[model samples]
Target: SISMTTKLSYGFGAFGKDFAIGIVYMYLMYYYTDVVGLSVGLVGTLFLVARIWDAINCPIMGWIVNATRSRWGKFKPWILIGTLTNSLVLFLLFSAHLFEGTAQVVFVCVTYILWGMTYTIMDIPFWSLVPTITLDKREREQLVPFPRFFASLAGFVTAGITLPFVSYVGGADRGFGFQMFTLVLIAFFIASTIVTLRNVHEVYSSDNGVTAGRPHLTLKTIVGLIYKNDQLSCLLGMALAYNIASNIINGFAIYYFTYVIGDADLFPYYLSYAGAANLLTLIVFPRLVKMLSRRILWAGASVMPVLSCAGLFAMALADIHNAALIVAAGIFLNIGTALFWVLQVIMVADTVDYGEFKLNIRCESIAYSVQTMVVKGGSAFAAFFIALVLGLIGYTPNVAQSAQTLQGMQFIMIVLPVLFFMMTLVLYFRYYRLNGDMLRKIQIHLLDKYRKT
Candidate 1:
């Protein structure tokens, strides 16, 4: 099991992931469309296409991470290398050297592909660390929230500063924006590196017993584990539902804040508040889940965002001009998001035990790769949907707004997100079947069987 301090360090280390991912989720696509001048359709196509490549790369990275032997341990060396590589790629991805044409497209494609692959290298190992740290069920429950709390805080900080800092360097329209991105990208990589070296440690220092009798992992072994595990089957289905719904909603956020509100100025203040609201959940939710059971608490978490989106839609229909209401809606959405993501992390960690018990193996790298690949699949789907909506709305930055564009903006910002929320809620409710007790039972069985073997 992980030490208390080690657990805290591990959780904080998640900021590395949040820092890298925030650039993609919050800023990158918009940067491509609005700043770099790629069409929304093309931006969407590139991500979807690249992520398909990631589906292949993620598994291979997983296999390599688990199979490799190194002084830093199987996973940590990759974490170190990935940190440096991902940072370098991000700087290149935003370089803006290629003019707004085919050259730009090719440059972005190559850089984005490299970024995703490097990210998978870091991500596969990082997620694999969790199960090795602690096998105790209650401890695992306690463990996840702390790390995610920091991760959310990191996201808040990243979102809070990105635009302002970029503007200070130069506005998003000119080359200055790319220069600022490069500067900040360097700092974030340094921060993540410090967090890893200063704090993070490999809980599973050896693979000796894990591979003692078993054959080295192959494509068959990886595929067999994913298909054969009942728990993984349920987990994957639920995760896909949640991830797709969440991505669809989040993918629309920039457009919602931009087109629906018709004011980029208000977005930063709103995002800061949004980050604060979500960050507060960490202060209390871990304790709350301890008392309520993960299943019931997750149910509570699911319904809040749906209500928030519902209220936002109602306000949009009324043509309500209250900034407070919109900000409040954003806050509630973050709260729901915070809890949902934290639970998902914990649930995935627990599934490792289920894998060990049911399949007689500990395969964290491959398991996380499968789950993460599903997340990308959802993200890709959301990107496509978002592009379709943008085209349908007849949105154009160059032209003045028409009535149809305004209505389309309202529909996408409010109505479509509400629909996504309902879909997410349904999937989460189905996920209630995989409770802590069930996870514990699986762990107990697996530990005994391994001892016998």
Candidate 2:
């Protein structure tokens, strides 16, 4: 059984993880473009390069973690090391004021690469713990939700309060405010990770004799694992699609509110409302998981975003400025995506079980690493696409966008995400095979086999 302290400690880890990531995702582009006066295309290119590198580095980090065995644990040592280095990088990423011109650009590129690598080191180990921490499938599922719920709240806190905080701190100097805000986030992130390191303990194996040891994993073996595990591939594809949709909407949300909706100040209020709506989804998730089939819940949740995106598109096209309509769309979108966020991690853990059952090898960190990679890959794609479109449409910072530019932003924000969501729905419904009954049966079989062995 899991302890309350374990749950609280795990949830605390996300308090910093998502807070740091949320600020970067929500504000980094704006900071580079508007405050730092850098080219949007250049910033976007930098993001793509960094994230693509992470796609490679994340898996290696997972291998390293899996191969590790120490008195402390396989995961916790890297968690501490990564957090300290990542915090310094986070500070540097926000310290645009420390450099000038070409020097600043080079600084950003170097720090971004470090940031991605370090985050991978921390992140891979964090989620990799889920499968090993408990043997009871139901209890495991319950544990998965806490960290995500906390992570969502972390993102929400950053989104809701950042603008006002920046305004208060910097007054006339926006760069100073953004830098200070980042410092605060870094501090919070370090504190949370410390709590996690201190409290959470890994349960390596069950009484049935399932063992944990450092395995000789090579690139060829990893490739074999990928090809053999069908469910991991499907989850990876669906997650990549979902994340691409989310990043486009999130990365460009401030621009949409400032330009398209003509109420930059209202952005915080929208996020606050959406955050509350997302919390409702979390509260309802476990109950829904109990009452409905996974397929039914996922299908129903998937449909919400399509409908919400359509509503958003229609409202924007009709030039409706009704804040109520936008809020309604935001709420629906948040509800759908938040539930998916909860479900995806749980499903990924399930895929790890499936992979082990079929292959007789446990690649928990590697599997989680792929999930992280796809998420970053999706963000990279969104960043590149958003930057490319902005450059193509002649978007100028801190000015009234031309009618053509506004239309382009609207299309990317609404139409593009709608298309992505539809693709996700199709991929998920077509390829994903594990449902509640199948997942339960697999768990039973694994338990019995391990006991006999």
Candidate 3:
């Protein structure tokens, strides 16, 4: 069993990791066009290119980490090295705001791609450490939700405080403030990982059965594992679809609060409400999992966001000005979306079992690697869509937008979510076959060693 102290240390690492990434996730777009003087069109292109690199890069990193035979083990070495480089590159990633002309463009592109690779370096091993922490599946469940809750907490803090804190700290220079913000997030990021690496122990390398002999994992075999796992593929598409909806909202939210609502500061308050709802959902997720099957839970997950989007969509159409009403809409939006944050982890972990059950390869790292992949991939597509359409609609940052631009923004924020999220609902109901019955059989077969990796 994993100790509480060890679990807390490992969980706290999520806070640090997400705190750093959350800044990029929520604010980097705003900072770029609004603060750094980049065109929206170019920023969109850069995001898609970075994700394209990660498509191949993430799984290869996972395969390499799995085959690593080191005294410290396969996961932690990458975690340590990745953390150090990721922190350095993250700081520089934000600092691209300081450069200018072609230099600024070069700096932004180079730093961002490097940050993506470095983040992959640590991220794959960090979560991959989960199943290795204990051999018991139930204990894994307990430990799994713990880190994710902390991750939600980080998102809460990052979403709620990033702008206000930067305003207070940087005074006139928002770039400097964003830079200052990265320093502290990186500090907590480094601090928490140190504790986790020192304390978190790998109990067994095997999934549910003995992994007695190490196979020589080729790129073909490694890629084949993910290729053949239909369950993982469906969930990957489901998660990507969900994040596509989410990133559109997240990418456009500040714009919505600023231009559409006529107050930039309101963005933080709305997200604070949304972030709180996300944390609350994570709190109840374990209970929800125990009480209901995935089909039922997923039904709720699929429905909540659309309902939330409709509420906000109505407000936009009516030209309402009530902050409290907006806050209420934000809560439902996050609760539905946030359930998937932990839900994705839980589902992906199950797919690992499914892969082991079906394909005889127990590569948890590689399976989980695509989670990070889709996160960036979804953001890329969403950002690309936003930037292209906004440029077409005449979006000029930090200024009053034209009605056409505002309408376009409204479409992306309030309408596109339903369109994209519906795709997730359809895919999951149709293709995701690891229902209660299938997972039950996988669990039974795993315990009996009917199939072993």
Candidate 4:
């Protein structure tokens, strides 16, 4: 096993990845529409088109990762290549200066597609690396929290500063965004990949300890694995319920801030406070996680969403247009949302182990890719639903919309999540019974059990 210091080095690298990538994710949609000058409709269309390619690429990457024999390792080489390509695409994604026309749409499609692919390259490999780096379940749990907390910090940094940077960068020069995004991504990519290479170690090869040279299964074999694995199936159910609930509300928050809230100046405060809520939890939560089960931590995380939805619903009916209340609500939502997210990833790592123990396979990358496919696919549907609802409510971009628009936003932000949280609780309570100690035992027992054969 590698030393603890080595593991931490990898953790910090992942922090940079999450932080930088988080910034790009939060702002890119807005940059495409408001700053880059694409319509919301075109933006939606381009994203859909790009995500289709992402879906196709993910499984292919998984297959290749499972099959390849590199001296360095299967997952690391991809991380290395992806860092450079990812940096270039991220820089170009924000650097475009297209005026209104088919040309802008084409530019959006090209860069957006490349960006999605690069993200998958980084994402699928990074997650897959977790299963390889360490088999001790408790250590993995500790490791999981670092990147997510750091990623939230990244989100905070991005959300707090990007809009202000707009004016700083000459508003529409495109060069400013390019320079800022490139340097940041390069820094993050180098940190993340270099540590990954230097610190993390891959201990096992191939699923089920089968020969790595074995032919990869066809679509039937892949699909069969999904159905056969109970842990994989259930985790998929919980993740969908959670992410859909999240994106629905977050997708609306930008518009809510820009229009219904009636003052964009209050946004930075909201973002900062939101980051703080999650940050404070990260500081104290590692200990709590040790004492509590993942189920309880996740359940507590769910509490934030339910409370935020209730608060927003109240805000809709109340006379309180005060920015502080809005900021308070945002912070509440972020805390619940961010907590649930981090725990969910940890749970995913556990599910990978559970699958290996039960099925005699190590399809960690496959598990992550398939889960991501479903979540992202669900996100696309959620985005469409948001658009349809807005269109029905007579929403238009860059123009005065009605007070009824606020009602629509409120419904998306509050009401839908009520059902989602309830569903998540029920599903999680049933599926997520694996605890840290239990996971470590499974690893020990499984390795021992397999070594005999």
lDDT agreement with native, every candidate: 0.71, 0.78, 0.78, 0.70
Tell me how candidate 3 scores on lDDT: 0.78
**1-453 per-residue lDDT for model 4 (tens digits):** 446766566667677677657656776766676667767777767777667668777777777666666778777787787777888887777767644577766766787788788878877777777766666656666666666677777667666665666656666675475457557657866877787687777665444344222335665566566668777777777777777777777766766776666575777677778878888877666677778866777887777777877776777678546676777778877778767766767667677777767776667777778766766766776666667766766674738866677666666556876787788788878766667577777778666765623
Against the hidden true structure, what lDDT does model 1 obtain? Answer: 0.71
lDDT by residue for model 1 over 1-453, one digit each (tens)?
457777767766787667767766677876787678887877877778988888777778878887787776777788888888888888888885456577777888888899898888888888777777766667777787777887887777777777777776766454567655666666766676667656666543337454222437787777667778766666676666666667766655655666665474777678888877887886678687877877776665666767777776777678645677778877877888788877777777767666666666777777788777877877776666666776766663537887767766766755665565566566656544556567768666655655424
Off by over 4 Å in 1: 33-35, 98-104, 170-177, 180-184, 204-215, 385-432, 446-453
RMSD of 4: 3.4
Which model, 3 or 4, shows the larger lDDT? 3
Error of 2 at 184 (Å): 3.0
Instruction: Please count the clashing residue pairs in each candidate, in the order shown.
Output: 1, 0, 0, 1
**Which candidate, 1 or 3, would have the higher TM-score against the true structure?**
3
Clashing pairs in 2: none
Off by over 4 Å in 4: 98-104, 163-172, 205-215, 262-264, 387-409, 436-441, 450-453
Per-residue CA lDDT of model 2 for 32-108, tens digit only, reads 88888888779867877888899878778877887776656777888888888988888888887568978998898
**11-48: candidate 3 lDDT, tens digit per residue:** 88877877778899777878898889888879877877
What is the clash tally of candidate 2?
0
